[PDB]
Scaffold this active site. Structure first.
Site, PDB file in Angstrom:
ATOM      1  NE  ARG A   1      23.133 -22.038  12.453  1.00  0.00           N
ATOM      2  CZ  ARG A   1      22.289 -22.955  12.912  1.00  0.00           C
ATOM      3  NH1 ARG A   1      20.981 -22.743  12.848  1.00  0.00           N
ATOM      4  NH2 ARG A   1      22.752 -24.083  13.438  1.00  0.00           N
TER       5      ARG A   1
ATOM      6  NE  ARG B   1      -7.129  -4.679   8.420  1.00  0.00           N
ATOM      7  CZ  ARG B   1      -6.904  -5.992   8.404  1.00  0.00           C
ATOM      8  NH1 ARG B   1      -5.732  -6.478   8.016  1.00  0.00           N
ATOM      9  NH2 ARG B   1      -7.862  -6.826   8.788  1.00  0.00           N
TER      10      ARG B   1
ATOM     11  CB  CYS C   1      15.039 -16.650   4.659  1.00  0.00           C
ATOM     12  SG  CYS C   1      15.924 -18.174   5.131  1.00  0.00           S
TER      13      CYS C   1
ATOM     14  CG  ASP D   1      23.406 -17.249   0.283  1.00  0.00           C
ATOM     15  OD1 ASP D   1      23.915 -16.547  -0.614  1.00  0.00           O
ATOM     16  OD2 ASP D   1      23.888 -18.338   0.645  1.00  0.00           O
TER      17      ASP D   1
ATOM     18  CG  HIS E   1      24.346 -12.649   4.314  1.00  0.00           C
ATOM     19  ND1 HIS E   1      23.150 -12.372   4.938  1.00  0.00           N
ATOM     20  CD2 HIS E   1      24.390 -13.995   4.170  1.00  0.00           C
ATOM     21  CE1 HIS E   1      22.499 -13.499   5.168  1.00  0.00           C
ATOM     22  NE2 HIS E   1      23.230 -14.499   4.711  1.00  0.00           N
TER      23      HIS E   1
ATOM     24  CE1 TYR F   1      27.190 -17.992   5.275  1.00  0.00           C
ATOM     25  CE2 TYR F   1      25.623 -17.944   3.462  1.00  0.00           C
ATOM     26  CZ  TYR F   1      25.895 -18.104   4.812  1.00  0.00           C
ATOM     27  OH  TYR F   1      24.887 -18.391   5.708  1.00  0.00           O
TER      28      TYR F   1
ATOM     29  CB  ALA G   1      31.426 -24.158   5.641  1.00  0.00           C
TER      30      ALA G   1
END
Lengths: 264, 264
Positions: free
Chosen positions: A21, A127, A146, A169, A207, A209, A263
């Protein structure tokens, strides 16, 4: 740790280029699962130093059903500042859903207590779940969970747990998450007079970065040190009465830490 | 199929003795994950015949947001009779949550449409989720969702999907579930002009009922035949306009079926 480094590598080898995003590229794979025998020790990443302090205060905060960062601040814990608003409100996130999931009929379910009852009175239940994925309040949340779904399992006096992290991440957030939930397993087991079993981690979009490659290779070159031992100095009267001091990590000798810029 | 038979075996080898709500014993393991490349063919178990007819009608039924078995009956599909009440009502199960998850503020979220929008307008999203686990309406349900959480993933024009089945009857229910969700992946991909990727199956309490041992060994001795090919005769205007006839399984040559009795 081994399972961790194995993932890190897999992502490098098999990850496909995908953007997030923010515009920063990530290397990502979909669907992965690693197991951690909790009897082998506390799964706290060694090939890089991790500060458990933030971890603990955040967990305790969740269990309080609190969604304001005030408590975190009193202890100078700022991992949630980035999202909180001027009042320090993050919205109906984790804590709120765990302790007061709101029903359409005006109730607030306490999923944590619910889960405790089951583990104590019907351990074979299939459950025994806690979900932070409340479709109804997604918009009002600072950000989507997340890790939003976990299940507890009992067998042979051993309490296990599987967490599903729809988004992860690997470098920055994964280590934190594993330790956090592992600590929760222990607290649960303590209150249920059960021994810790396996912590099973499953992830969706797992993932790295693009601007974390060097840190990855750097860590990927270190050798895992033995796992430390988590010890609980006391047995609170309930799952809601643990205090920071009750926990003590023992035998943790990690490699140096590794900064991971982001970033914006 | 291979991945399937591998599980079946694993459960026999590593499963621990656990009892279920009915008193029947099961052999169970916690945490497992198998992948199915959808380009390799439709994952319909071959070492035993499976009737896709029920599967299809049930999926279509879900997508209609219907929770009454009437539609199923019109097509003489009785897999839900066991739970429906005198009126044929099962409560706010799958269908209801998928198409009309009720919020505390009087709304009804359409998770299926929501998901479609995302796949079409923000494919890199990491929160493309559909949840049937609505804590608020658990009690009102005929029974808790076995498979209650699935995530979609897009990468290189390939649409993948991971389902989390918190509870799973390996012998009776698993085959059915895999095919059902695999078919959903295809429908999704068709409406999004995307190619099918991987169907990833993750399970929590994965078990075999003690009184299914012979059937298990019997199937465990058959050799997997090649996978069939699923073909869609047309492209409906929406995900809600598929009809039974639109699907045709091709090249499916299974071994004979195997009856699996249940205690009550």
């Amino acid at each position: 740790m081994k399972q961790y480094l194995e993932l890190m590598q897999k992502v490098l080898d098999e990850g496909t280029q995908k953007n997030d995003r923010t515009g920063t590229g990530t290397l990502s794979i979909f669907g992965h699962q690693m197991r951690f025998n909790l009897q082998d020790g506390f799964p706290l990443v060694t090939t890089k130093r991790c500060h458990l302090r933030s971890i603990i205060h955040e967990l305790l905060w969740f269990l309080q059903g609190d969604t304001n960062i005030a408590y975190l601040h009193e202890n100078n814990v700022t991992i949630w500042d980035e999202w909180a608003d001027e009042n320090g409100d993050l919205g109906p996130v984790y804590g709120k859903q765990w302790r007061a999931w709101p029903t359409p009929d005006g109730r607030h379910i306490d999923q944590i207590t619910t889960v405790l009852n089951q583990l104590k009175n019907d351990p074979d239940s299939r459950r025994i779940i806690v979900s932070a994925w409340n479709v109804g309040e997604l918009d009002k949340m600072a950000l989507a969970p997340c890790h939003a779904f976990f299940q507890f399992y009992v067998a042979d006096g051993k309490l296990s747990c599987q967490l599903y992290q729809q988004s992860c991440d690997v470098f920055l957030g994964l280590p934190f998450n594993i330790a956090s939930y592992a600590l929760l397993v222990h607290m649960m087991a303590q209150q249920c007079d059960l021994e810790v079993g396996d912590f099973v981690w499953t992830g969706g979009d797992t993932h790295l970065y693009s601007n974390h490659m060097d840190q990855t290779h750097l860590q990927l070159s270190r050798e895992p040190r033995p796992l430390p031992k988590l010890i609980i100095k006391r047995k609170p009267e309930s799952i809601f009465d643990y205090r920071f001091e009750d926990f003590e990590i023992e035998g943790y000798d990690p490699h140096p830490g590794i900064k991971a810029p982001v970033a914006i």
